[PDB]
Amino acid sequence: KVNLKQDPAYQKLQEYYDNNADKINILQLFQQDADRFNKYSLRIPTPNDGEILLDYSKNRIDDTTFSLLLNLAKSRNVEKARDAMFAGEKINFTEDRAVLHVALRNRQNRPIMVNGKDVTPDVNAVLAHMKEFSTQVISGAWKGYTGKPITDVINIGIGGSDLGPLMVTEALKPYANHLKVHFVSNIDGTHLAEVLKRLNPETALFIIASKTFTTQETITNATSAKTWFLEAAKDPAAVSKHFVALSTNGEKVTAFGIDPKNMFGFWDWVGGRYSLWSAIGLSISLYIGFENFEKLLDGANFMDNHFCTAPLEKNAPVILALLGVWYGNFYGAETHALLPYDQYLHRFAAYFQQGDMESNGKYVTRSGATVDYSTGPVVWGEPGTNGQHAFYQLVHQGTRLIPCDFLAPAQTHNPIANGAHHKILLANFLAQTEALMKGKTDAEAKAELEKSGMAPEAIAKILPHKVFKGNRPTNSIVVKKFTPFTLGALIAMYEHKIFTQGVIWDINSFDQWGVELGKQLAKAIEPELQDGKKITSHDASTNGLINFLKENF
Amino acid sequence: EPKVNLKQDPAYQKLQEYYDNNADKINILQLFQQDADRFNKYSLRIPTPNDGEILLDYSKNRIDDTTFSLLLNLAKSRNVEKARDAMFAGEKINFTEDRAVLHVALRNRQNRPIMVNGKDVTPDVNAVLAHMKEFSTQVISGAWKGYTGKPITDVINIGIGGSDLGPLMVTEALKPYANHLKVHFVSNIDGTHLAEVLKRLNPETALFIIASKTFTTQETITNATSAKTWFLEAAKDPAAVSKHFVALSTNGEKVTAFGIDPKNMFGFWDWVGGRYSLWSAIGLSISLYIGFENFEKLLDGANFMDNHFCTAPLEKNAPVILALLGVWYGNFYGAETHALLPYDQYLHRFAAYFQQGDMESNGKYVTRSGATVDYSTGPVVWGEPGTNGQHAFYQLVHQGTRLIPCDFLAPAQTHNPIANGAHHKILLANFLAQTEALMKGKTDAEAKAELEKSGMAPEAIAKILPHKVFKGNRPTNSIVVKKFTPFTLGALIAMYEHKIFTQGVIWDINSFDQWGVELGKQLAKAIEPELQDGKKITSHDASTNGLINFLKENF
């Protein structure tokens, strides 16, 4: 696969950019084209959750740009790559592994082969186990060491074993049963300690989420949790009523004191940052029930089918991928913001900060060459209207191009004050994207200042500060309501956007070699922090930091 | 006193020429190889009276002695010291709004006179503080009763922007100092936010704090009126309102019309920016949660940093140093972002807070003279605490295509030394190793030597090798405190406040206004009636119409 800057489609986009960059103005495009919203929006009907609208019209694209972008998807063989993923080819080429999160939500049970065997029965067997356990815990059948029902579920995991379950349980809170859920991930003892203070050992269920069952942070947290537990329970045999594992290592799990009957497995073709759909989603199933966890899978499967069947010019993940490449590789924007106008989705941007950045924060191509072009952006955001009142000043009147995805539901789960709060929330959702596109010219701001009765000199002083240049691009995504289905569909849509960008950049979206160096160096430092001896083994900064911390232990 | 266009400033030109000649050659590791005294030269220890030293280690940066000199000349050329003194004197440096900028007066612990409109603001500041102290002790003690004669159990701050983020972030950061009160923060106009708090409350024992200067802020007042409605459904007595709602505000007319007694209005002043307001009456939720004595220590820490910023010569002045590094990376290397990475779960909202304080301050494009900038201003600020961030996005910081200066922060001591300190040792090892890694990287030779030592078939070594290389040369600041306490937190917040200020000075922008809010607010007001009415909407651009009409079909 040829270096991307020598790809003829990429070259054509560079030529066009170099000649037209500065002449693309979104408002002017709207003024000249009454069909613009119809042309650059996609409505995706669902069986039972309404339509999903993707409105990508407030972007710096016209007919020429859109064709040139589609042609880049074609020249980088996005469709072929997609089909390779879905067929279980070993597309994680540095680890020589398949990439099959889509198998976890294969609701049609189509055969998908790995090492000569269909994985569907294995996937479905884990799901049936999750369903049985969930019912046992939720119903009170599963009892603690003094014979009581569980009241609290504590997930302990890092990265992919934490963010997904945390984000989704917060997003789908209205669907919760009576169980309280807690998430521990930081090695910082604060994280565990503040959870344990809320708990009764007799009614607490811990879920230790780690494939290896040797991950440092998660095992340390797990063992500290066990120690606390046994201070209450005294009896090591009681650990098996209060600790279960999402893992492959039956020996280690058994040695920790978990019954291996309560080990929920998954596979090397499930990436951590694509894992919430697996056994890793057990805390989701427990919190909102298995039938809701299945609807989340259904939504994801729906989107997987859209990604597979929709032609490129009507394929939501592709179009999103292409827009990001446009802003990132041609306009040079470093970042991309996720702005859900929904407080429950407060951790959505954090979740994709991982799914996107850990996937596409790469620099080596499949041929082993180093890229000479931009790859993944810094992904960030806060839900509206909170972010709106924190940082939008800079999105409107700073020096930066920041493409933003604005998301909202038509309906709220909390229609307080006869719906009044939701109307205001949606008005802001709409107005901000309108504002970013349209801006406010010198003439418009001046006319306002005159009509307000300000004198000419005062108007001169303030006027430049009141001008909004606009032409700032946004996508708007609307659902009828955020439900397990529509959330699953959206998560999967972003998963496939990320995949498609990786294919264009010819990187490996599915490995993570970049975490190895810090892990090694941390292991080397651990023993040096065990006493007050002066450390000289590193560069002078690391040494100097270590000795300062020793003075202050 | 507008300044020359920054790219024309002779000190900025000198930097540009040096960057043009040396950007490709500056390698942090090499600079350590060649200067054994590097850590000593490019670090600062600031002793505090009771909280140990604060260490800023800025040695893992793409700077040599020439770079550092040239950056200091820029802070001189742009008159940072004069601009500081002007702020601290009460001059009207918020030039678009013609207002003073005096969050430093909120923590003026020495009671120095500070003049606004011919009057010392110090007595005013101190009266409000005295009031906050009296009220906080009354609520905390149980002496302040609800409408059925019970002590308060829950405190609900309602506010947006600067009336929320500071109190939220500081209560989370100082949670080990909390008393028995539960604190709640409602900010979003999204009904979910209020509703999920109200479910946990007993109207007999809940106290609401309505934080808004004008007392007209739409989202805050909508939330407040909904809370009041809930409240009165239970209390059924307009008089009960004054036992359960207080205001952080100066509009006594509107407060009192809401049902709050003006005795329970805690005022602040127009020279207090929202994003710099937690030190004022706006901090009442903090005072309530961790007690007034602790709130004063927070103030003391900020005052201590204010004094440092005033007295330290540029070359040993932490805010200025951090500001100048950020201009180096932003304006010369072109980096768009800056990451804040506290290795501290209590500080999980620290980056979020500085998203506002930095980006709403310096996300600006018009200079003091009214001219549009032709250089970059404020970066996108972002981050998550360690080690959470570490397992989310550090792949990209290590091996992506982007320069991302990061501030790593950690304490030598934890408030939660569980398992005999074992978690905190690991936490610290990661705090240290990550910046070491970012600086040192790992060459083809280093990677290959490791691979050789695993039983790796040479074929497989060759195919994996390039993926295992780390370019390194990625800069960081490391900030260490003895412990995150109210004082050390206050000092660090102020430090970043003064970083932001110094950058604003250099860029010749107004760090203290926020005219960028207005267009969106006006366009939302127009849309409101259109969401209610029956008609197909056609008054906007096709996208806004299309979105409206799709929403309307799904109502």
Contact A510, A92 (CB under 8 A): yes
Using CA atoms, how far apart are residues A427 and A430, in angstroms rounded to an integer?
5
Residues B321 and B461 in one domain: yes
List CB contacts (< 8 A) between B225 and chain A.
417
3-state secondary structure string across A254-274? HHHCCCHHHEECCCCCCCHHH
Tokens at A21, concatenated: 């960059």
Q: State whether A531 and A388 are in the same domain.
A: no
CB atoms within 10 A of CB B137: 16
CA distances from B306 to A269, B356, B496 (A): 54, 20, 11
**Rg of chain A over CA atoms, in angstroms?**
26
Nearest CA in chain B to A536: B36
CATH number at residue A540: 1.10.1390.10
Residue type, A486: T
Amino acid at B451: L
DSSP assignment of A3-69: -GGGSHHHHHHHHHHHHHGGG--HHHHHHH-TTHHHHTEEEEE-SSS-EEEEE--SSS--HHHHHHH
Q: Which of residues 267-326 of B touch A (CB under 8 A)?
A: none
Label the pairing between strands B119-120 and B115-116. antiparallel
Q: What ranges make up the beta strands (E) of A368-435?
A: 378-380, 404-409
Write the secondary structure of B316-344 as one string of H (helix), E (strand) and C (coil): HCHHHHHHHHHHHHHHHCCCCEEEEEECC
| C-alpha triplet B181, B186, B188: angle, nearest 5° | 165
Closest of A463, A432, A467, A464 to residue A449, by C-alpha? A463
- Give the rounded distance of the alpha carbon of B154 from its chain centre: 26
Q: Residue A188 and residue B424: Cβ atoms within 8 Å?
A: yes
Beta-strand runs (E) in B224-379: 245-248, 265-266, 337-342
Q: In one letter, which amino acid is B413?
A: Q
Contacts of B255 (CB under 8 A, 6+ apart): B210, B215, B247, B249, B262, B265
- Same domain assignment for residues B378 and B523: no
Task: Give A-chain residues touching B459 at CB under 8 angstroms.
Answer: none
Residues forming a β-bridge with A143: A149
Q: Are B412 and B482 in contact (CB under 8 A)?
A: yes
Of B222, B519, B528, the CB nearest to A421: B222
Q: Do B222 and A420 touch (CB under 8 A)?
A: yes
Across the interface, whether the CB atoms of A190 and B416 are under 8 A apart is answered yes
CA of B545: how far to CAs of A342, A430, B376, in Å? 21, 9, 34
Residue tagged active-site, from A294, A358, A382, A495: A358
Q: Which residues pair with B210 in a beta bridge?
A: B158, B247
Tokens in use for A462?
A: 């303030």
Contact B401, A482 (CB under 8 A): no
Count of residues in chain B: 555
> Does B256 contact chain A (CB < 8 Å)?
no
In the numeric block, the tokens 């040192």 are attached to B440
CATH label of the domain that carries residue A196: 3.40.50.10490
**Of B211, B340, B275, B339, nearest to B497 (Cα)?**
B275
Q: In A431-514, where do the E strands start and end? A: 474-479
Angle formed at CA A495 by CA A492 and CA A500, multiple of 5 degrees: 125
What resolution does the deposited structure have, in angstroms? 1.5
Query: 3-class SS at B184?
Result: strand
Cβ atoms of residues B186 and B158 within 8 Å: yes
Q: Which two tokens stand for residue B203?
A: 């109207």
Q: Is A369 close to B515, i.e. CB distance below 8 A?
A: no
Cα distances (angstroms) measured from residue A170 to each of A246, A484, B351: 20, 12, 21
Q: What is the CB neighbour count within 10 angstroms for residue A47?
A: 8
Say how far apart CA B59 and CA B201 lie, in whole Å: 50
DSSP E strand boundaries for B413-534: 476-481
Collapsed DSSP state (helix, strand, coil) of residue B36: coil
d(CA A436, CA A440): 9
Candidate from A343, A362, A379 with C-beta closest to B399:
A362
Separation CA A108–CA A199 (nearest Å): 41
* Cα A330-B516-B159 angle, rounded to 5 deg: 120
Cα A41 to chain center, whole Å?
A: 23
Q: How far is A260 from chain B (nearest CA, A)?
A: 26
CB atoms A55 and B196 under 8 Å: no
Whether residues A501 and A437 share a domain: the answer is yes
Whether residues B235 and B379 fall in one domain? no
Q: Which residue has the tokens 């306009």?
A: A331
Measured CA to CA in angstroms, residue B53 lies from A22, B177, B313, B359 at distances of 51, 21, 18, 29
Count Cα neighbours of A309 within 13 Å in the Cβ-side half-sphere.
7
Count other C-beta atoms under 10 Å from residue B2's C-beta. Answer: 11
- Quick one: A161 and A111 in the same domain? yes
Contacts of residue B263, Cβ cutoff 8 Å, sequence gap at least 6: none
Compute the distance between CA of residue B345 and CA of residue B347 in angstroms, rounded to an integer: 5
In what order do the strands lie in the sheet containing A474-479? A41-45, A51-55, A474-479, A404-409, A335-340, A378-380
The residues that bridge with B186 in the sheet, in sequence order, are: B158
Cβ pair A195, A184 in contact under 8 A: yes
Q: Say how far apart CA B7 and CA B398 lie, in whole Å.
A: 31
Q: B382 to chain A nearest CA, in Å?
A: 7
> What CA–CA distances, in Å, run from B197 to A74, B95, B142, B158, B206?
50, 40, 22, 11, 11
Q: CA-to-CA distance for A201 and A199, rounded, in angstroms?
A: 6
Least Cα distance to B510 among B83, B52, B46 occurs for: B83
**Which of B194, B335, B345 has its CB closest to that of A191?**
B345
List CB contacts of A254: < 8 A, sequence separation 6 or more. A260
Burial A467-482 (b: 16+ CB within 10 A, else e): bbebbbbbbbbbbbbb
- B366-390 per-residue burial string, b: 16 or more CB within 10 A, e: under 16: bbbeeeebebbbbbbbbbbbbbbbb
Residues 366-385 (B) with a CB less than 8 A from some CB of A:
366, 370-373, 375-382, 384-385
Contact with chain A for residue B219, Cβ under 8 A: yes
For B510, which DSSP code?
Answer: -
Q: Which residues pair with A155 in a beta bridge?
A: A183, A207
Structural contact between residues B242 and B202, judged by C-beta atoms closer than 8 angstroms: no
Largest CA distance in chain A: 83
Chain-chain contact of A391 with B355 (C-beta, under 8 angstroms): yes
Q: Which of B244, B265, B296 is the last residue of a domain?
A: B296
Kindly state whether residues B425 and B371 are assigned to the same domain: yes
Rounded to an integer, what distance in angstroms lies between the CA atom of residue A118 and that of residue B106?
68
Inter-chain touch A465–B515, beta carbons under 8 Å: yes
CB contact under 8 A, B382 and A382: no
**B347: which 2 tokens?**
């500080």
Identify the three-state secondary structure at position B110. coil
Place of tokens 């906080």: B136
Helices marked H in A213-344 — which ranges? 216-233, 250-256, 282-288, 290-309, 316-325
Q: Structure tokens of B69?
A: 């000199």
Q: Which residues contact B467 (CB under 8 A, 6 or more apart)?
A: A94, A364, A368, A508, A511, A513
Sign of the Cα torsion B529, B534, B540, B545 reads positive
**Residue B420, token pair as written in the block:** 């005999």
Within 8 A of B222 by CB-CB distance, chain A residues are: 417, 420-421, 424
Give residue B365's region: left, alpha or beta (phi > 0; psi -120 to 50). Answer: alpha
Does B524 contact chain A (CB < 8 Å)?
A: yes
* PDB experimental method: X-ray
Cis upstream peptide for B387 (omega within 30°): yes
Q: Write the DSSP string, A465-478.
A: GG-B-----EEEEE
For residues A117 and A91, membership in a common domain is answered with no
- Please tell me the distance from the alpha carbon of residue B38 to that of residue A179, in angstroms, as a whole number: 54
The reply to whether B60 and B171 lie within a common domain is no
Q: Is A358 a catalytic residue?
A: yes
Nearest to B397 by CA among B436, B339, B347: B339
Q: Are residues B324 and B198 in the same domain?
A: no
Rounded CA gap, A374 and A23, in Å? 23
Structural contact between residues B170 and B207, judged by C-beta atoms closer than 8 angstroms: no
Which two structure tokens, joined as six digits, stand for B484? 């995150």
In B, minimum Cα distance to A221 occurs at B423
A188: containing domain: 101-294
- Total beta-carbon pairs less than 8 A apart between chain A and chain B: 508
CB count, 10 Å around CB of A111?
11
Residues 385-404 of A with CB under 8 A from B: 385-386, 388-400, 402
Note whether B57 contacts A: Cβ–Cβ < 8 A. Answer: yes
- Report the interhelical angle of A316-325 vs A63-75 (nearest 10°): 100
Domain count, chain A: 3
Radius of gyration of chain B (CA): 26
d(CA B483, CA B190): 37
Token readout for A181 is 């859920």
Helix (H), strand (E) at residue B433: helix B422-440
Smallest Cβ–Cβ distance between B364 and the set A173, A342, A397 belongs to A397
Residues A470 and A552 in one domain: no
A465 in the same domain as A361 = yes
Q: Which residues have CB under 8 Å from A428's CB, separation 6+?
A: A341, A384, A385, A388, B189, B520, B524
Q: Is the peptide bond before A385 cis (omega within 30 degrees of 0)?
A: yes
Here the tokens at position A175 are: 């669907």
> Considering only alpha carbons, which residue of chain A is nearest residue B464?
A94
Contacts of A59 in chain B (CB under 8 A): none
Q: Do B527 and A427 touch (CB under 8 A)?
A: yes
Spatial contact of A496 and A310, defined as CB atoms under 8 Å apart: no
